[PDB]
């Protein structure tokens, strides 16, 4: 009943916030992989990740998710601490690799979102 | 009613495939970002990705999911093409970024694994 939908909604919320952070992390990697990483684009993407993470932390009452998100925050500070100026591959087309990676990782992201939408739609339809 | 539960089951199979492919792509990027990437390890991971994808494609009946999976296959072939050049001369100067990226992405993967477990608990329980 209400308790049931509450918990189901808690998990969908977790899936959604973690999905946003996964995309934003990939956004940062895509930027860093280009031949000349756009510092403006990178700092904006870092800002996105930060805003989503902190809103998540503020809007979770769940003791476990709270714990996980705290761990993500710690690891995100370490990611930024170790972010290099660029990731040049001397013998490869960096722009091309960045684009190929971006294309694939977005398709995987969309495949997961399509499957999830299918799961939810079928469960909702079954309620009839 | 069995066809109903089978359609549901095939959706879960597809999301499990998606999660595994994302894990493997993560593994491969971590390797590629090392000061000295293990080409052998990269190869094993890339073959694992292809095995998992083909198993997924062979199982899926849903038309939209089949299309998405075929698109992943095409995109992966394009990514694969860049691999040899990335191994000839590494992108990174030390392992610091690879290690921090790995630590973070694993935490994000775990959070999704837990959430999916929760969605299923709630679905199966009803």
Automatic annotation (TrEMBL), chain A:
A molecular-function term among this protein's GO annotations: phosphatase activity
Keyword ATP-binding: yes
Subcellular location: Cell membrane
GO cellular component: plasma membrane
Keyword list, A-Z: ATP-binding, Cell membrane, Kinase, Membrane, Nucleotide-binding, Phosphoprotein, Transferase, Transmembrane, Transmembrane helix
Designated name of the protein: histidine kinase
Species in which this protein is naturally found: Pseudomonas aeruginosa (strain ATCC 15692 / DSM 22644 / CIP 104116 / JCM 14847 / LMG 12228 / 1C / PRS 101 / PAO1)
From TrEMBL, chain B:
Subcellular location: Cell membrane
GO molecular function, one term: phosphatase activity
GO cellular component assignments: plasma membrane
Keywords annotated in UniProt: ATP-binding, Cell membrane, Kinase, Membrane, Nucleotide-binding, Phosphoprotein, Transferase, Transmembrane, Transmembrane helix
Record's protein name: histidine kinase
Complete-protein stretch covered: 42 to 164 of 595
